[PDB]
Design an enzyme around this catalytic site. Structure first.
Site, PDB file in Angstrom:
ATOM      1  N   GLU A  72      30.425 -17.867 -33.800  1.00  0.00           N
ATOM      2  CA  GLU A  72      30.377 -19.295 -33.980  1.00  0.00           C
ATOM      3  C   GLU A  72      28.961 -19.848 -33.901  1.00  0.00           C
ATOM      4  OE1 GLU A  72      32.462 -21.409 -35.047  1.00  0.00           O
ATOM      5  OE2 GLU A  72      34.446 -20.414 -34.732  1.00  0.00           O
ATOM      6  N   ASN A 100      29.371 -31.065 -41.042  1.00  0.00           N
ATOM      7  CA  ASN A 100      30.342 -30.847 -42.097  1.00  0.00           C
ATOM      8  C   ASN A 100      30.454 -31.984 -43.098  1.00  0.00           C
ATOM      9  OD1 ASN A 100      31.535 -28.358 -40.928  1.00  0.00           O
ATOM     10  ND2 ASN A 100      31.836 -29.767 -39.219  1.00  0.00           N
ATOM     11  N   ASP A 146      33.202 -33.596 -43.942  1.00  0.00           N
ATOM     12  CA  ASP A 146      34.141 -34.639 -43.567  1.00  0.00           C
ATOM     13  C   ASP A 146      33.479 -35.553 -42.553  1.00  0.00           C
ATOM     14  OD1 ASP A 146      36.258 -32.779 -41.195  1.00  0.00           O
ATOM     15  OD2 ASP A 146      34.080 -33.183 -41.163  1.00  0.00           O
ATOM     16  N   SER A 160      32.202 -34.816 -39.662  1.00  0.00           N
ATOM     17  CA  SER A 160      32.292 -34.285 -38.306  1.00  0.00           C
ATOM     18  C   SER A 160      31.149 -33.306 -38.102  1.00  0.00           C
ATOM     19  CB  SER A 160      33.653 -33.641 -38.072  1.00  0.00           C
ATOM     20  OG  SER A 160      33.741 -32.406 -38.727  1.00  0.00           O
ATOM     21  N   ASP A 193      30.182 -29.795 -35.543  1.00  0.00           N
ATOM     22  CA  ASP A 193      30.555 -28.756 -34.597  1.00  0.00           C
ATOM     23  C   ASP A 193      29.381 -28.594 -33.633  1.00  0.00           C
ATOM     24  OD1 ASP A 193      31.825 -26.968 -37.357  1.00  0.00           O
ATOM     25  OD2 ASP A 193      32.972 -28.171 -35.997  1.00  0.00           O
ATOM     26  N   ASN A 230      34.543 -29.229 -32.489  1.00  0.00           N
ATOM     27  CA  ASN A 230      34.425 -30.244 -33.538  1.00  0.00           C
ATOM     28  C   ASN A 230      34.652 -31.657 -33.036  1.00  0.00           C
ATOM     29  OD1 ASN A 230      35.990 -31.764 -36.003  1.00  0.00           O
ATOM     30  ND2 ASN A 230      34.412 -30.443 -36.724  1.00  0.00           N
ATOM     31  N   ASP A 256      46.300 -26.126 -26.698  1.00  0.00           N
ATOM     32  CA  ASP A 256      46.817 -27.002 -27.727  1.00  0.00           C
ATOM     33  C   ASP A 256      47.755 -26.323 -28.718  1.00  0.00           C
ATOM     34  OD1 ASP A 256      46.303 -29.841 -27.935  1.00  0.00           O
ATOM     35  OD2 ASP A 256      45.801 -29.384 -30.045  1.00  0.00           O
TER      36      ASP A 256
END
Ligand SMILES: [Cl-]
Ligand code: NA
Length: 129
Positions: free
Chosen positions: A35, A46, A48, A50, A52, A59, A101
């Site tokens: 990562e 990114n 969109d 967002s 990271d 994110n 989650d």
């Protein structure tokens, strides 16, 4: 900060990630390698809107607030900048919330592609943990 492999394994151990929700320690070290290349300051911006953040590339659309991500929630209840520390505590505490989650470590794209399926014990070779 950039971690060495065993230095990070030790740190994650001390934060209780070994067998956390069924995922052995090697999983987490492998995830961090692919990562962020063990870098607490890593960012990836990114399309969109967002970003990271940090050593586990968490994110901003769901998990932290950076004030600039469209349709943002803050389920770890932290500023995203907290994930850019040399101290991995905030990243670990938010990661714990994420793996619980419901889709386990498949929340991490690099884990699911690069770690899943392989012998992850190799990531802690020579560490003497
Ligand atoms: Cl935000
Ligand atoms: Na957010």
């Amino acid at each position: 900060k950039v971690f060495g492999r065993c230095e990070l394994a030790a740190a994650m151990k001390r934060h209780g990630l070994d067998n956390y929700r069924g995922y052995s320690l090697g999983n987490w070290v492998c995830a961090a390698k692919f990562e962020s290349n063990f870098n607490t300051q890593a960012t990836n911006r990114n399309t969109d809107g967002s970003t990271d953040y940090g050593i586990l590339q968490i994110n901003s659309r769901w998990w932290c607030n950076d004030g600039r991500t469209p349709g943002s929630r803050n389920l770890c209840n932290i500023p995203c900048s907290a994930l850019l520390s040399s101290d991995i505590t905030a990243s670990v505490n938010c990661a714990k919330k994420i793996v619980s989650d419901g889709n386990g470590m498949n929340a991490w794209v690099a884990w699911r592609n690069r770690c899943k399926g392989t012998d992850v014990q190799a990531w802690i070779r020579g560490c003497r943990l």
